[PDB]
Write a protein that binds this ligand. Structure first.
Ligand SMILES: CCc1ccc2c(c1)[C@@H](NC[C@@H](O)[C@@H]1Cc3cccc(c3)CCCCCCC(=O)N1)CC1(CCC1)O2
Length: 375
């Protein structure tokens, strides 16, 4: 049919290793698990043996394969792949009831890209052509979907926490059963990454009081393919200082704040109360209007196996990244048709005794124009 209930719970994954959706490529249909990545724009799949691949795309066996006789490579933050461009027919079984001819990068070689036992064999870049490789003429999968079918030009992501993870990618719309309260929208500043503008940051109700330009230096992006909340150096330093001070009744290894060492407590004794909430204020849809999303320590302390955790806020020199840990517990609407991103409290929100993850508005914020970074 293509109705939204068919896409509820269509995502799986492992903590820190991305979320993936099932797809098929070719005729007969070949099934692969595909990482869902709002931080890139290339559709690429393993297409040759690799120690970490359980299966891969075999172009010889597909009668609808077409070679584009062109190479391609994509460098991500920690890994990269190269391969051969082609087109083929693509479907999402737990998706809309459609089949599109899409661009596909067949991965022949890679370095630190695939992850040992992640269960995915490819990546679906859902951001815009501007960051596609080799260049912005290689149409991204979602652009092809929208062009070739009646699927509306938007999708939404409900990434759920815990170890296995699950969630939903609603292709073509919004499923009202996956969130509560109001959707709050922030403009997509520019169509490349899903770029947005942070206008204020508060920690436990205390304004960081930095020039708002620091928050978006050199950009702020919403990125399901990145695990952590990643903050520019100056912001990261101020947030860490503030988070250290709030939790200074416990002792922490110094490698913990850099994201290397685990910290552990007796099962069920995690002192959540000493870790502050973080509020990120985002530019809204009307003049002088913003809204805020509030992050609980259960989002930025990632469980890894006594209860053990990694600090999931880290330093960046390439701007703010609102990664999976921020997106978890929110329903995120990538409303491309209207150049905006919506946030609402997810149905699978995180539980804290006395505190709640929230999306709240409206707020008044003057001079939000000034928060955007320019060279
Ligand atoms: C166009 C390719 C590209 C290049 C650089 C880049 C990005 C994208 C932005 N998004 C990164 C994600 O695309 C990438 C997806 C991914 C690839 C392979 C494996 C995973 C995730 C799961 C494990 C996490 C790897 C580290 C984060 C990452 O590179 N995610 C994130 C930023 C932009 C600001 C930081 O850097």
């Amino acid at each position: 049919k293509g109705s939204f209930v068919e896409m509820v719970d269509n995502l799986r994954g492992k903590s820190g290793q991305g979320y993936y959706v099932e797809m098929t490529v070719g005729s007969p249909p070949q099934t692969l698990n595909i990482l869902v990545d709002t931080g890139s724009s290339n559709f690429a799949v393993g297409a040759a043996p690799h120690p970490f691949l359980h299966r891969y795309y075999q172009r010889q066996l597909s009668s609808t394969y077409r070679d584009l006789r062109k190479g391609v490579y994509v460098p991500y933050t920690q890994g990269k792949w190269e391969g051969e461009l082609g087109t083929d027919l693509v479907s999402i079984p737990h998706g809309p009831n459609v089949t599109v001819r899409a661009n596909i990068a067949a991965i022949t070689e890679s370095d630190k890209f695939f992850i040992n036992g992640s269960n995915w064999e490819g990546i679906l870049g859902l951001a815009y052509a501007e960051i596609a490789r080799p260049d912005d003429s290689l149409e991204p999968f979602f652009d092809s979907l929208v062009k070739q079918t009646h699927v509306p030009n938007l999708f939404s992501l409900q990434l759920c926490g815990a170890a296995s993870v699950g969630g939903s990618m609603i292709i073509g719309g919004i499923d009202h059963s996956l969130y509560t309260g109001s959707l709050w929208y922030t403009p997509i500043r520019r169509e490349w990454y899903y770029e947005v503008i942070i206008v204020r940051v508060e920690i436990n109700g205390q304004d960081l009081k930095m020039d708002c330009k620091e928050y978006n230096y050199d950009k702020s992006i919403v990125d399901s393919g990145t695990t952590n909340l990643r903050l520019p150096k100056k912001v990261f330093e101020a947030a860490v200082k503030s988070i250290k001070a709030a939790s200074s009744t416990e002792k922490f290894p110094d490698g913990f704040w850099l994201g290397e060492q685990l910290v552990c407590w007796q099962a069920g004794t995690t002192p959540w109360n000493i870790f502050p909430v973080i509020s990120l204020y985002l530019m809204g849809e009307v003049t002088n209007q913003s809204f805020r999303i509030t992050i609980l320590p259960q989002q930025y302390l990632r469980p890894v196996e006594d209860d053990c955790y990694k600090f999931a806020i880290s330093q960046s020199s390439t701007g703010t990244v609102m990664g999976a840990v921020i997106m978890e517990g929110f329903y995120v609407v990538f409303d491309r048709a209207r150049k905006r991103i919506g946030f609402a409290v997810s149905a699978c929100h995180v539980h804290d005794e006395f505190r709640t993850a929230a999306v709240e508005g409206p707020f008044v914020t003057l001079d939000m124009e000034d928060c955007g970074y320019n060279i």
